[PDB]
Short mmCIF file of C-alpha atoms in Angstrom, two decimals:
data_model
loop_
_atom_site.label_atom_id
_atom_site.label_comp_id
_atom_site.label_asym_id
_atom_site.label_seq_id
_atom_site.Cartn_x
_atom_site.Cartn_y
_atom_site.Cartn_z
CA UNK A 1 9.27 214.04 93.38
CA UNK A 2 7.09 211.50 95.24
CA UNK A 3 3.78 211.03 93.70
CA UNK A 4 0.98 208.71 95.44
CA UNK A 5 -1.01 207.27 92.35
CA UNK A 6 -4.16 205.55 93.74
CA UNK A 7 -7.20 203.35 92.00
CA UNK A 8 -9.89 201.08 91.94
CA UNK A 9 -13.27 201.51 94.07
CA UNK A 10 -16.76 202.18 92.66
CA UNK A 11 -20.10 200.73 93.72
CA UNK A 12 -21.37 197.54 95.76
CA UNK A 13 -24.43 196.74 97.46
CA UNK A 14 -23.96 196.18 101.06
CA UNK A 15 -21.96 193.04 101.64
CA UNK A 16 -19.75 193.32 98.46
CA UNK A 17 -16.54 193.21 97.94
CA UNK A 18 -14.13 195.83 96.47
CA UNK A 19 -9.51 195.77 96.19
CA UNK A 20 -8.38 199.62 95.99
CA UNK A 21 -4.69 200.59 96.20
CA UNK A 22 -2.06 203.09 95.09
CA UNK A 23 1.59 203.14 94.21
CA UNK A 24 4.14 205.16 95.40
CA UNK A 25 6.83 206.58 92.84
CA UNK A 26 9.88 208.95 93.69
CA UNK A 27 11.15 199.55 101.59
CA UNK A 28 11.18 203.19 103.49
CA UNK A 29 8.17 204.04 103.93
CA UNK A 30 4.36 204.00 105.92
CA UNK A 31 1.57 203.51 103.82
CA UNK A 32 -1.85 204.25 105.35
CA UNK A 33 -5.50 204.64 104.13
CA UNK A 34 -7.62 207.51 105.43
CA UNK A 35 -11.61 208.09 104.58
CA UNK A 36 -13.15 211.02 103.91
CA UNK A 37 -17.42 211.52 104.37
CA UNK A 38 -19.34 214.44 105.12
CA UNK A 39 -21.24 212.76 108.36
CA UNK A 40 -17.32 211.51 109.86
CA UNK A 41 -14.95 213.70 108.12
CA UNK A 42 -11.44 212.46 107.73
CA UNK A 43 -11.00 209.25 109.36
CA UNK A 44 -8.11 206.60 109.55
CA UNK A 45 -8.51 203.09 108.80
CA UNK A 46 -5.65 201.12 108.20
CA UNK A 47 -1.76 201.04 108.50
CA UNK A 48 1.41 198.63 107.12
CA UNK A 49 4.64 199.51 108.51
CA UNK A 50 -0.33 196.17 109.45
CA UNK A 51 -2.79 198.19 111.95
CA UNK A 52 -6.67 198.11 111.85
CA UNK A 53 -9.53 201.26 112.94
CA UNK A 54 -11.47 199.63 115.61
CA UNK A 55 -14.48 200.10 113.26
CA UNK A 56 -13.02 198.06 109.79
CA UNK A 57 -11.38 195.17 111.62
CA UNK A 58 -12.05 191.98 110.23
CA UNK A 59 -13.28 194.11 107.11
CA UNK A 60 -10.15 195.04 105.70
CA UNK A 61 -7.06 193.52 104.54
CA UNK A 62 -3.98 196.24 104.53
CA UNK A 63 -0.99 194.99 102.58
CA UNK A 64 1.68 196.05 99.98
CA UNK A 65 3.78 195.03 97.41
CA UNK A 66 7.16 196.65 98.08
CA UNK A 67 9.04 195.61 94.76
CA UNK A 68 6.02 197.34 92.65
CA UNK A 69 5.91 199.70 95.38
CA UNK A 70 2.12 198.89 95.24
CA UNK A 71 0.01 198.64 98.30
CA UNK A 72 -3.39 197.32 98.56
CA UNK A 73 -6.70 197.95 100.77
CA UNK A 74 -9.26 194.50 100.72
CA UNK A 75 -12.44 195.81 101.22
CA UNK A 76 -15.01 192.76 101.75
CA UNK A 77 -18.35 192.42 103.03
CA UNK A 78 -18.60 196.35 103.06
CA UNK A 79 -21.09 197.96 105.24
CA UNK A 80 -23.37 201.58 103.81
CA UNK A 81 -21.41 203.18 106.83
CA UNK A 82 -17.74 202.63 104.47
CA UNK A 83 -18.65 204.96 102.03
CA UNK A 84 -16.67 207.10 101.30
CA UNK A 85 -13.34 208.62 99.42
CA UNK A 86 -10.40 207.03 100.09
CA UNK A 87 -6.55 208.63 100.15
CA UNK A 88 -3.61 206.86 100.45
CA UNK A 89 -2.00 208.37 103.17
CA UNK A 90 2.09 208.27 103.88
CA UNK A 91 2.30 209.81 107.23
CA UNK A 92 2.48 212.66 107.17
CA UNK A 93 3.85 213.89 104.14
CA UNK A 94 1.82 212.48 101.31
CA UNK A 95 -1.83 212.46 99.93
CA UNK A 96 -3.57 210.40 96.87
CA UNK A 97 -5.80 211.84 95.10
CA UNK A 98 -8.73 209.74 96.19
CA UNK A 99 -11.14 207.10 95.07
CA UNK A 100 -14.74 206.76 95.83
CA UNK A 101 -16.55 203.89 97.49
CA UNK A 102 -20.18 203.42 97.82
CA UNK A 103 -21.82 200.74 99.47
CA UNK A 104 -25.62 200.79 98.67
CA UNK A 105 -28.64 198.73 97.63
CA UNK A 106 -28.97 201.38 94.92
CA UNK A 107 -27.78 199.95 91.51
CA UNK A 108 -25.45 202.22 89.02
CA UNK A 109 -27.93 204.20 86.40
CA UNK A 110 -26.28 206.32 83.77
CA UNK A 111 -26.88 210.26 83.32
CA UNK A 112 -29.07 212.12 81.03
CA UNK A 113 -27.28 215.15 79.99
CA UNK A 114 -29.11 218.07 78.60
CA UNK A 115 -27.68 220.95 77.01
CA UNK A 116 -29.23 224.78 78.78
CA UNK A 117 -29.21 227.69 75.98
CA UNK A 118 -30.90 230.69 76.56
CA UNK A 119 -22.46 240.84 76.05
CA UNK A 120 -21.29 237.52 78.32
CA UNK A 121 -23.60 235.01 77.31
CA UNK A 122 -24.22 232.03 80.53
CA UNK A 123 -25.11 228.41 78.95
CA UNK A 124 -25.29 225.24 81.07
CA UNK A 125 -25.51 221.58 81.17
CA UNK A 126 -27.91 219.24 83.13
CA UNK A 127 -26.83 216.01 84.47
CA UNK A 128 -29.65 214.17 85.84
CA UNK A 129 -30.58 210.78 87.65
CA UNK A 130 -27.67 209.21 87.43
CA UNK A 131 -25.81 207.03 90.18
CA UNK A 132 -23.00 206.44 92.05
CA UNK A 133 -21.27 209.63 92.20
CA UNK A 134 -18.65 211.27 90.61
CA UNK A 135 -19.31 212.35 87.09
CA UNK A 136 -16.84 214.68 85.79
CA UNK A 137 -17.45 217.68 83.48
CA UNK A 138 -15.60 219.65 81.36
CA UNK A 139 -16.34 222.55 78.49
CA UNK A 140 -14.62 222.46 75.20
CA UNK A 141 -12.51 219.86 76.46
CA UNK A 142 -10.81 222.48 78.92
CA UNK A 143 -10.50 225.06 77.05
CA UNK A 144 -13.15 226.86 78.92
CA UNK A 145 -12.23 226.98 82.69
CA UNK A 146 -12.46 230.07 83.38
CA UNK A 147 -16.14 231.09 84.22
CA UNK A 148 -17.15 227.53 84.61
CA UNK A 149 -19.56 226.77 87.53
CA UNK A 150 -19.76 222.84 88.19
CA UNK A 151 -22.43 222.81 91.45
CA UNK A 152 -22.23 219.37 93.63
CA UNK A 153 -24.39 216.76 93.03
CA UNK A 154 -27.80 216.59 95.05
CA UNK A 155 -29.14 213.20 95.91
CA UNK A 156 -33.17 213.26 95.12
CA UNK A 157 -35.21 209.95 95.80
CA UNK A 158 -32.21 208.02 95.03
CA UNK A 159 -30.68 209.59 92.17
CA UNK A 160 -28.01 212.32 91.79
CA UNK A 161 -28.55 215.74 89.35
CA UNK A 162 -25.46 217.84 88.82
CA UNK A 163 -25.09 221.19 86.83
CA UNK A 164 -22.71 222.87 85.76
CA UNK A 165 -22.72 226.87 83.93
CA UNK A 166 -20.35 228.60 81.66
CA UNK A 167 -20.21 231.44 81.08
CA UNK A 168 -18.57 233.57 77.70
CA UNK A 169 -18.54 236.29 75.65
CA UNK A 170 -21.32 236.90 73.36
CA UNK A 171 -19.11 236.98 70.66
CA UNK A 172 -17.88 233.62 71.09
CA UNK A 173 -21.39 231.36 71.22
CA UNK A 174 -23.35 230.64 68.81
CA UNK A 175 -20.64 231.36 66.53
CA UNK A 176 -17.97 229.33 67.86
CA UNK A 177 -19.51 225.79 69.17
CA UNK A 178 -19.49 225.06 72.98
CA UNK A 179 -19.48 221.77 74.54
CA UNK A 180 -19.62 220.22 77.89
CA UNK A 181 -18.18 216.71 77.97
CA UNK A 182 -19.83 214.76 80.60
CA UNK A 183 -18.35 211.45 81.61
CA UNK A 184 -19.55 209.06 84.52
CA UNK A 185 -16.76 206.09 85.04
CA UNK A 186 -19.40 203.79 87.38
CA UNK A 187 -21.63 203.51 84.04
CA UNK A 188 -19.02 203.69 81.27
CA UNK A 189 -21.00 207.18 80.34
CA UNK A 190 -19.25 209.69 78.14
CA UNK A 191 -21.22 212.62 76.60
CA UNK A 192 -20.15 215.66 74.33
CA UNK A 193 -23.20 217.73 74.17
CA UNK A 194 -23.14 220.70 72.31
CA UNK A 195 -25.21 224.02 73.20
CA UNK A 196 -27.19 224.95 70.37
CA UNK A 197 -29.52 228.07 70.77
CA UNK A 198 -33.41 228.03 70.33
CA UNK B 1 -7.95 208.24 121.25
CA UNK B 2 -6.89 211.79 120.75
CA UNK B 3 -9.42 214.25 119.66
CA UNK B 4 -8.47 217.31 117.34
CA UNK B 5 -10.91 220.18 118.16
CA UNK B 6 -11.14 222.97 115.34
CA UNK B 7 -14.25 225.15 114.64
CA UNK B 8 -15.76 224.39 111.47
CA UNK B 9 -15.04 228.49 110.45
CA UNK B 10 -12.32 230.51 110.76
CA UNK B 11 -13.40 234.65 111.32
CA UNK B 12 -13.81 235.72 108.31
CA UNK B 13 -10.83 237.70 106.94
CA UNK B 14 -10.12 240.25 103.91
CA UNK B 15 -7.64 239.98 101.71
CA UNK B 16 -4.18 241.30 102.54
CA UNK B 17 -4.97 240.83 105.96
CA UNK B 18 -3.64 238.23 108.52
CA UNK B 19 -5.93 235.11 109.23
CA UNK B 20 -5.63 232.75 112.45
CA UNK B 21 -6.93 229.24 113.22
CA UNK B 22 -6.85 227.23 116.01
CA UNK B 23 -6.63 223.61 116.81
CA UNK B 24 -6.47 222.13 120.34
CA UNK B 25 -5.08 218.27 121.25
CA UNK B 26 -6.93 216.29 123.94
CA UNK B 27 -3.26 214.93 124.97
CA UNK B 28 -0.21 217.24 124.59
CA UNK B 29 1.98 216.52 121.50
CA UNK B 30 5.21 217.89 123.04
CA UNK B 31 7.77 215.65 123.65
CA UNK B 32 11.05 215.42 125.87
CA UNK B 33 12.78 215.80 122.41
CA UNK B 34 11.64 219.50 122.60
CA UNK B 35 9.61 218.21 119.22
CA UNK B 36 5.78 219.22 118.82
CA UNK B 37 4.12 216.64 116.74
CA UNK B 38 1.65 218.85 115.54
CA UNK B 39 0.97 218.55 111.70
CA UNK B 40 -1.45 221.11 109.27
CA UNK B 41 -3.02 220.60 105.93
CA UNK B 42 -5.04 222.32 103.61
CA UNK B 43 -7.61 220.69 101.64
CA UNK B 44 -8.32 223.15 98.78
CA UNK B 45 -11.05 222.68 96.53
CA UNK B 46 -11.42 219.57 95.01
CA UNK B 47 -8.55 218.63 95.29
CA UNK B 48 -6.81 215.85 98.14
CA UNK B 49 -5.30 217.32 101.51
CA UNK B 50 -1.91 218.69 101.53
CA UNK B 51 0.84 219.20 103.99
CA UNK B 52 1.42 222.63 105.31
CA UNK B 53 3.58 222.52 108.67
CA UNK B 54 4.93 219.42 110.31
CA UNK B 55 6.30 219.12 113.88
CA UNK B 56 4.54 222.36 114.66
CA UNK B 57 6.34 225.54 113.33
CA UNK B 58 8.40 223.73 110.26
CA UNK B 59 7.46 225.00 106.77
CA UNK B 60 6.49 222.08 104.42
CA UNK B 61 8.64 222.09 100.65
CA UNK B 62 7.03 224.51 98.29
CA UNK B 63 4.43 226.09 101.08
CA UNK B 64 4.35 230.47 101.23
CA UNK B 65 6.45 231.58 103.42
CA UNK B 66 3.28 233.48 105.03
CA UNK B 67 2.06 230.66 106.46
CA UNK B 68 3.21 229.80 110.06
CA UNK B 69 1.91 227.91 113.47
CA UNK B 70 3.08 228.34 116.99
CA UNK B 71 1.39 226.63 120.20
CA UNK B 72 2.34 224.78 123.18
CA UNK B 73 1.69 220.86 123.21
CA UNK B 74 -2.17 221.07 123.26
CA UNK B 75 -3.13 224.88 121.78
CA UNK B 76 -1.73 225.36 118.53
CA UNK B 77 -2.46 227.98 115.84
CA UNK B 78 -1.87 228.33 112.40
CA UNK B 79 -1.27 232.08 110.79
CA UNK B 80 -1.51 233.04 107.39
CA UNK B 81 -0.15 236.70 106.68
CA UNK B 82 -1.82 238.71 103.72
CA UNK B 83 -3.66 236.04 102.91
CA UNK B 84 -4.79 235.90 99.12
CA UNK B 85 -7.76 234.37 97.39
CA UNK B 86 -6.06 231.09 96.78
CA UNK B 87 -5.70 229.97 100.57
CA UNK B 88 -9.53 229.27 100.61
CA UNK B 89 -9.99 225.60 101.65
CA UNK B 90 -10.36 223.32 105.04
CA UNK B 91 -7.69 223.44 107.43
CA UNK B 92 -6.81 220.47 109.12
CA UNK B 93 -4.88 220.01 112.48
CA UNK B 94 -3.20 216.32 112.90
CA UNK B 95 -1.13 214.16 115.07
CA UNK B 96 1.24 211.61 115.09
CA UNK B 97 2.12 210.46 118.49
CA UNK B 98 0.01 207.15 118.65
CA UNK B 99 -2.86 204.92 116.57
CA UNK B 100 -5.17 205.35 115.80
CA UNK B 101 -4.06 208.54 113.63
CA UNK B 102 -6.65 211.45 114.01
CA UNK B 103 -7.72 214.71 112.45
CA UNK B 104 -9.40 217.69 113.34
CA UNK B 105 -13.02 218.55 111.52
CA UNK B 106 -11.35 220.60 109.85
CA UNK B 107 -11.94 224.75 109.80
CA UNK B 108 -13.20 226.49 106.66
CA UNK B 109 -10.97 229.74 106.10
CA UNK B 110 -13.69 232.56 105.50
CA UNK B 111 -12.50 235.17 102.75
CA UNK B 112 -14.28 238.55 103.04
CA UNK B 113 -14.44 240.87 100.24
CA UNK B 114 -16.24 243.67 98.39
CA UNK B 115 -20.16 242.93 97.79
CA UNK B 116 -21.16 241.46 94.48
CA UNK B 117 -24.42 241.33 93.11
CA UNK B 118 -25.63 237.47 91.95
CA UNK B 119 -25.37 237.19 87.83
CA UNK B 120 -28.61 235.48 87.11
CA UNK B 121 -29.80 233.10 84.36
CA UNK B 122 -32.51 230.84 83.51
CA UNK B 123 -33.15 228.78 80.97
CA UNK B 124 -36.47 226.34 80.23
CA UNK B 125 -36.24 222.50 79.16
CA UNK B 126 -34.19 221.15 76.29
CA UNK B 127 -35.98 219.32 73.15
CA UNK B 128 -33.83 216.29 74.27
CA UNK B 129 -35.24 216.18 77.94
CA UNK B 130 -38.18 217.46 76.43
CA UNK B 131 -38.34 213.71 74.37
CA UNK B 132 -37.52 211.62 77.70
CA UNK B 133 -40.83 213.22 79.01
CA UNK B 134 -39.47 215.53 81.87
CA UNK B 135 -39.17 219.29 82.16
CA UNK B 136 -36.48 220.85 83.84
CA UNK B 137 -36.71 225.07 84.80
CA UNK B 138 -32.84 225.56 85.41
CA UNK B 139 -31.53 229.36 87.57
CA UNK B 140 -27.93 229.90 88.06
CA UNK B 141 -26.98 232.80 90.26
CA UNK B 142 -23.70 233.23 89.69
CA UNK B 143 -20.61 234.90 91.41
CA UNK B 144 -22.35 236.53 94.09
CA UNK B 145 -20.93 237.67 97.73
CA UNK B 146 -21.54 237.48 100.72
CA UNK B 147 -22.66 233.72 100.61
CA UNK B 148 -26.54 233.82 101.75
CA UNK B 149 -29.11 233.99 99.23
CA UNK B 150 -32.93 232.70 98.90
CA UNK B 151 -34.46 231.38 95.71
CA UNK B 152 -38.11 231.44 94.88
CA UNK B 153 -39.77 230.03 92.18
CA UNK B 154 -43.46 230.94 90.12
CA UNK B 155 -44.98 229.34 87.46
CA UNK B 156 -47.80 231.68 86.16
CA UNK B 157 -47.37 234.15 89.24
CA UNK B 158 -47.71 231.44 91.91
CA UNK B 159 -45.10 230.18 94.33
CA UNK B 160 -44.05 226.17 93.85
CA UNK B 161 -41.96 224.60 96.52
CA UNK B 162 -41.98 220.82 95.20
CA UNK B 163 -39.77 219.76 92.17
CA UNK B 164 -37.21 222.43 93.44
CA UNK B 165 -33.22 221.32 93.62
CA UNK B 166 -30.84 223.72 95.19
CA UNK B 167 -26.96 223.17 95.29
CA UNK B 168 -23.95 225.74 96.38
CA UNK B 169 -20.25 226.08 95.04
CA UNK B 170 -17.94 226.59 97.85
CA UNK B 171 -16.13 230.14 97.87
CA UNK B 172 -14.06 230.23 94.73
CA UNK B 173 -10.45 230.60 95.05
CA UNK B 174 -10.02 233.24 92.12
CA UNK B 175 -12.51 235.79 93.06
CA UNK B 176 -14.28 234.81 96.62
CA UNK B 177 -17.35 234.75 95.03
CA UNK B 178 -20.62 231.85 95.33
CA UNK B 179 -22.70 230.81 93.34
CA UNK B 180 -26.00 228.81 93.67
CA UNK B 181 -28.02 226.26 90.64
CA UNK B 182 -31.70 226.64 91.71
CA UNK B 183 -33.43 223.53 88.96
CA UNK B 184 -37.45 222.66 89.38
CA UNK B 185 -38.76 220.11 87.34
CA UNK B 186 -42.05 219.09 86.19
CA UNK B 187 -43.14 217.00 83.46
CA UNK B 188 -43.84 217.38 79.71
CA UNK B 189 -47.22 217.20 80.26
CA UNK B 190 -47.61 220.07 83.28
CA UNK B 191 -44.77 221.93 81.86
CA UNK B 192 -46.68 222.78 78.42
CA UNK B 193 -49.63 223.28 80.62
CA UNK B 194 -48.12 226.85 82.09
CA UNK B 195 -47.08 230.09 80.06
CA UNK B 196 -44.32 231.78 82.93
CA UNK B 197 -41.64 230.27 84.83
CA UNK B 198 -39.98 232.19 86.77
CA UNK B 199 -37.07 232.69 89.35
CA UNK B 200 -36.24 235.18 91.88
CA UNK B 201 -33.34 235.80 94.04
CA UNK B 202 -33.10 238.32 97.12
CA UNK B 203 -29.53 239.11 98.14
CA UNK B 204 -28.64 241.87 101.01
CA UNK B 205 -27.41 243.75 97.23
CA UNK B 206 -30.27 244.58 96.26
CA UNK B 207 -33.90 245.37 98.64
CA UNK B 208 -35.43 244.67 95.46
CA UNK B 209 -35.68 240.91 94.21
CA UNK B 210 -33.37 239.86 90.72
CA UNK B 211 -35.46 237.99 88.98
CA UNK B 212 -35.20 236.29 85.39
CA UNK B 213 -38.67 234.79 83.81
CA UNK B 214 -39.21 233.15 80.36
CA UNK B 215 -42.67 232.31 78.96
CA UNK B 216 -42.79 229.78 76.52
CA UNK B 217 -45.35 231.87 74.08
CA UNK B 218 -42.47 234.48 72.96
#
């Protein structure tokens, strides 16, 4: 089974600097790096067989280590306009799973996460003013999946608010605890609040 | 360089039925090889972009069998038989005949199902946000179809726009429902100033208004 692990990326202001890559598991083979934004949509940027997107040369430095198979993307003096998530690519058979770049003059600002309580019982979580994106969340560590609602982020005057809602039998809250666990990587956040009713 | 050209929405389809989407090339992608290099991928929710069909009409490892695309070297389209809830997601059209490498914008596959009335929920302001010195009104309207829905918010019987943040889920691949988080915030200070908060949602469901209140004097 190939598997395309990729990592790195995070936040810089505009002009900083930033090395993501990925590793290929499972000498043969293309590695490219495709970015994904909601303004551009998926859009190519870089190739070693090394090739350059009009718009990133000079940028970007494509390169790999084939004995770890472990390629590299150097991302200096980044411009707003590269934000983005970034997939290792092997055309055309293989995807990363992503990592997100932001370039912005914004600085990284951790969540505050507040617990929502009031036959199914609905509770929620509020994750607000926080930046870069992603934060991650999760209820009873996974074990509620089922009925979850996590809603995308919204940017407001320069911070991001996410929710997210669960919902459960009655039966099962207050009397059994519920949790959302709340982490944010960009701010070394990790939260584990607990829904306790009124 | 080539350009991919998809719509951004396939017709809506219901399940068990047969779904089409189209993709056209700028330059053709057929070769004197009698090869097509024509390549789809889904992007499911969340989740990265995976392969589909490569060189045209070849099945990628591990994809349904009810998947398929025929075309010539610039109209292609992909076909998904009986399609089930799970093959919600962006479809992407792709080449590989010269740099740079380039995608279509992708086309949302449109599930239609039976109507659902929105679940809705609201819930006032924590004690801990409460303590930071902001107030946050919070409405989820959950699992609700078809997809359009308007929010409006009251506090004490009058309408407030500003404070409001709306966000959307994508159509869930279990049920082909949405959903909708409808938060307005205020602060401490105006927050224990008013008595009712309240949201209402109108959805082609119901020619009556859902709506959920709370008033902090109960």
């Amino acid at each position: 089974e190939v598997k395309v692990e990729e990592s790195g990326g995070g936040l810089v202001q505009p002009g900083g600097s930033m090395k993501i890559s990925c590793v290929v598991s499972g000498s043969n083979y293309w590695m490219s790096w495709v970015r994904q934004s909601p303004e551009k949509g998926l859009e190519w940027v870089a190739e070693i067989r090394t090739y350059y997107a009009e718009s990133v040369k000079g940028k970007f430095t494509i390169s790999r280590d084939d004995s770890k198979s472990r390629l590299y993307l150097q991302m200096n003096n980044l411009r707003t306009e590269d934000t983005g998530i970034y997939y290792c690519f092997l055309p055309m058979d293989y995807w990363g799973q992503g990592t997100s770049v932001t370039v912005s003059s914004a600085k990284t600002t951790p969540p505050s996460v507040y617990p929502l309580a009031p036959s199914m019982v609905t509770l929620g979580c509020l994750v607000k003013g926080y930046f870069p994106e992603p934060v991650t969340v999760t209820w009873n560590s996974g074990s509620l999946s089922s009925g979850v609602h996590t809603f995308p982020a919204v940017l407001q005057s320069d911070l991001y608010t996410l929710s997210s809602s669960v919902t459960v039998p009655s039966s099962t809250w207050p009397s059994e605890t519920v949790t959302c666990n709340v982490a944010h990587p960009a701010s070394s956040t990790k939260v584990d609040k607990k829904i306790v009713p009124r | 360089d080539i350009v991919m050209t998809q719509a951004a929405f396939s017709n809506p389809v219901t399940l068990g039925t047969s779904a089409s989407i189209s993709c056209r090339s700028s330059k053709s992608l057929l070769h004197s090889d009698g090869i097509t290099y024509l390549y789809w991928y889904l992007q499911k929710p969340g989740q990265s972009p995976h392969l589909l069909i490569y060189h045209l009409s070849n099945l990628a490892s591990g994809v349904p069998d009810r998947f398929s695309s025929s075309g010539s070297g610039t109209d292609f389209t992909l076909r998904i038989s009986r399609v089930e809830a799970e093959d919600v997601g962006i479809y992407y059209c792709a080449h590989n005949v010269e740099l740079p490498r380039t995608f279509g914008g992708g086309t949302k596959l449109e599930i239609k199902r039976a109507d659902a009335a929105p679940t809705v929920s609201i819930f006032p302001p924590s004690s801990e946000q409460l303590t930071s010195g902001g107030a946050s009104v919070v409405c989820f309207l959950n699992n609700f179809y078809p997809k359009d829905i308007n929010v409006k918010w009251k506090i004490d019987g009058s309408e407030r726009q500003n404070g409001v943040l709306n966000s959307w889920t994508d159509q869930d691949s279990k049920d082909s429902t949405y959903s909708m988080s409808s938060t307005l915030t205020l602060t401490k200070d105006e927050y224990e100033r008013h008595n009712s908060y309240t949201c209402e949602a109108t959805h082609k469901t119901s020619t009556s208004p859902i709506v959920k209140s709370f008033n902090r004097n109960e």
